[model samples]
Target chain A: KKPLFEVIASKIKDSINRDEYKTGMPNETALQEIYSSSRTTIRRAVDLLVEEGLVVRKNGVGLYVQPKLTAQNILEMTGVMKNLKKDIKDFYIRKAGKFYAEIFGMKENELVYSIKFVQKSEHGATLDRLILPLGLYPDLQAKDFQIINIIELVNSGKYKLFELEQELQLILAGNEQIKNMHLNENDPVFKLSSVFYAENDMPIAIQYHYEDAESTKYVVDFN
Target chain B: KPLFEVIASKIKDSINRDEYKTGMPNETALQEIYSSSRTTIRRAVDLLVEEGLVVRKNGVGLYVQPKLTAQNILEMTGVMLKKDIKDFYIRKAGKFYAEIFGMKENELVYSIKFVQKSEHGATLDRLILPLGLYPDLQAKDFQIINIIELVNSGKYKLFELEQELQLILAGNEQIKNMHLNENDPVFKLSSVFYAENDMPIAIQYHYEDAESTKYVVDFN
Candidate 1:
């Protein structure tokens, strides 16, 4: 078996990876109780993590998780929260009238719905914009978008949804995108563009996801 | 779609959202399509320039700028050898352990590096495959063993493919000596193909030089 201190350090690292300790500083007494160990053992474990550069103690404050210790996937078309352990911080919806026709292969006068949201985790933040054909779903609210996946709202008997195409871009974060994502203007970011297709290959949704690159990576699989 | 913004976006969309190609269409065509005056058309193209999507090629016309945009078609879609290859040459090949290719630790795998010249430019590719899987596969017509053809052949019964794109950080002298210059903002597409329930079958790392080649993929 691994030493007590090593096990404790591993547990702390796993929690940090899981984004459990958002403030990066776990209570020392709490950790001692959980580990059922003496103060010296827990302190030794924390000290080991501190030496590894994964955690740093502030003067008179608790340890902070090094931002660089985390990385998240930016490619998933849905479930950004379930995968990243993030929480939706904000949501906005608008009735975008008369959207692009050719994009969804609809008439010029067809209405579209625009949904924007921000999610935050220990890794960082992501800004998401999902545009859908209004004809597909007439009953969607801003609160309905709080879920991790968009499919949950659009799952009606009339249409069986599937992902059609996706494109990824690595570019400098624009001012608006940087502001929404809490990133530097010059920092590089990943922009993932996706299209969802409904029954008979009909276009259903278009998405633009902006993620801070310093804290995220993408692993997209195609079958 | 906004008036001028839609016009600019149409031009970009016509080129499959790629900001790397020479998408400079004649002004007359755009004018006819949008039914706009030259002043309006020029304003639309100006918006594209401001957005760093297209640039005026002096007196020639507007061209797609390789600023924040470069087409990474390999990452955009599945693997396909759908290029007008003008020439190809095998640079090197040998048995090597490619842990990144999902091979066992220090397991022997066949690795080959080759160069392909197309109408756009040169692309350098490195293909890795575990030697045991392709026992009958020979390197006689090495180019035929390209990753796309290998997967298409179903020799290993490929299952899923994973792809990722990142900026070119460090390149060796061998790849840097090619048309791909150093410090150029380009994408390195790393793809891994799996077969038989998550067993990595093949891995390919393609260095795409946006300045030389144009990548386009369309999905309806």
Candidate 2:
């Protein structure tokens, strides 16, 4: 027997297939018709699909199809992904602003490159970024700073892990995080102390991630 | 047969029973007294992390975050405290299914209650279960027990969850209790698992919160 969400999944999939819900336009009416399900069921199905990264609901407009939201939290010093087996729901790179290296205790001129990303799930969002300080990492831009598998690279003996910590406190949402994520000025950012290690636990990359409380979780395991 | 790691688990049980040490205290001495290799000692500490009680680093020091909704958890507990107590609402989901049994004293029978968050606000700590399920539970004093701690106590010395935590979206009554319009979004978090003795223990918490950032424990 097929699950109810599966049937509703097909309806939403077929609607997207029909272009009734386009990239920029989301059609709830078509959903109301084809599935004949109440708004809750349809929305639950859509929410699950949103988690699957198959559909998206804009704040005011409606739900649309978005097939690109897969990125690992490698920027986290630990590179551990727990419970959030839900593939990346959304991902993109934002250019390094002045605050990039400054937050990490570097002078502006000592920065090489930094890129910020806001990771989103149906339930919430997180702020993550990769940073290379100028004086500390002059050769960073020689390669494509725009993209690379950080975990693979770091594990392959390129970068080293420095320090990791998780502290809970309130911090203002900088313009970047506030503009891109569903947050306000004074929300608390649950910080993860995701520091890395050297071959012998060296401090190489230091990551600062601010995660949403509802959707993000961390897991650790011993043999 | 006893699970292999649980041999080391007795060492862990020793810590819990003795309340030996927590946070960044050097436990290497405990390893020496247990006569286990550092390799085994590290493994035990890692297990502690999985149980959502401790953290360890290669060169740095070990750390601990006291559990208040510990699993990959966000700050809902803190947010729930800040919310107006008046706005919280609860709905019963029948009696918890497992309450019917050869329940022993201090073991709990249950009513599952889901409390809704304020409008646009999110509630932290998604669960509450009665203490009557575990035959090991003694003493009538539960007023001070955090439900998650009970969830952990119900699961001492066990490793690897039999199933992933369960989540149900929302039922009609649970939805109405929140005063949300019929189609509003809410999260239903649940768990169903057998204790070491192979009895079913199940309960789910309905998290209540507003959709807004101020009241909800949001990460963005």
Candidate 3:
């Protein structure tokens, strides 16, 4: 016969898959009563769920179910909208120096708007830094920087998003990211950088998103 | 006049674009070079050091940090190197393999393992194919590195490919193969190739060292 913990873990996994624990999982006492087992068995079963990325525990808080993996188009946007929430942290106009200028195909001294924000979903948090050439949206205001309405803003006018180029890397979390995303030092972060292009291959904007690797997965299909 | 952070930003841009490949100037030289105060220059250099773009050597100078190589994940259909087939065998399809190939358990399948190497690092590749579909595969040479080329050569038409990527910790075997330290992050790329009628032809697993390579994708 399989171990008691394994059987309990399998049942708990099925419950999670069925959306039984939508808000969060029960505490140790409740789990013990439900399984009619000792603390050790419940803890072992919960640890299995944690390892499988099915659940996450918040310090001083209860365990919560991880968000379902959404089908993401990396070319369209870097962040997902599953229970989307965003907070703008910083926004300003800056000179597009050599590094960003080359990516945007603009002169080094041209102006660009730099927007920094945080997006949080049930999956986890992501720190997004976006740079857009000021020339393209001269009338752009801070109000137009909402993360959710970006798709409408980009495709509403004469401009069209024709192409996208993206680079994904796994890197250690930086101090800024650690503080912003509540990540620990040396934790792996998924750094996804993308460049959006308009018709005639004109570069529109550049975006860099840092996400907790444990909470994210990417899927790609080829025909 | 721009602030020290502004100067720091420009220097970061230069370093990222490879304008300063050799090394950065000393603090005193930077102060004069950028027409800024010594404190400003110091703070500017500190920013780069904090961001991991530059490393400082005591009594020496600062140097640009080397970055990992980027590979086009969507287009990389071949192996990293001309790998040698380490082992070959036929095994009964277990529950996992049966689900992947849409076959019944206990069916026979061919398993091939390869050790792919490059100048910087190495990766382990495992390929599994249903034996009944490719009965003569064992007689064919396993020296080929490209999966598409290998599959097409067997007179089967490849219709599509699907890829799934995830980050996982290296196990003992992976540590020894790639020379990675304990708990090093690994990129596990699993691919499924299909034939006509959406029949799964082969399943491949590639274990790569995350520190050495990054994946790129482009769309239009």
TM-scores of all predicted structures = 0.38, 0.26, 0.35
Tens digit per residue, CA lDDT, model 2, B1-220:
4332663476556545535432244457746666767777677777766765554433544543332232212232223223222221112223433253333323324332324343354443333333333334332222122342345455342111222221223346545555554434344333443444655454434344223333332222
- For model 3, the superposed segments whose C-alpha errors exceed 4 Å read A1-168, A171-212, A216-223, B1-81, B212-220
**Minimal lDDT window, size 10, model 1 chain A:** A69-78
Q: What DockQ class does candidate 2 belong to? A: incorrect
Which predicted model would earn the best TM-score? 1
lDDT of 1 at A93: 26
Model 1 has fnat of: 0.00
Looking at model 3, the pairs that clash are none
Model 3 C-alpha lDDT per residue in residues A43-80, reported as the tens digit of each score: 88888877886665544345555544233321123343
**Tens-digit lDDT string for candidate 3 (B68-135):** 22321112223335665555555567899999889976776667776668645788778887755664
DockQ, per model, reads 0.02, 0.01, 0.01
Q: What is the DockQ of candidate 2?
A: 0.01
Model 1, range A1-223, lDDT digits (tens) per residue?
8999999999999998776753215667778898898889988999998788666554334555543311132212234423354344333222343555777777655455555667664447777777766566545422333334444444431365543455556667787676777877667676767677764668778877776655223222111
As for candidate 1, its clashing pairs are none
Model 2 bad stretches (over 4 Å): A1-108, A134-150, A153-159, A162-166, A197-203, A214-223, B1-220
Off by over 4 Å in 1: A1-83, A86-100, A108-123, A126-170, A192-209, A213-223, B1-98, B105-163, B169-178, B193-202, B210-220
The clash count for each model shown is 0, 40, 0
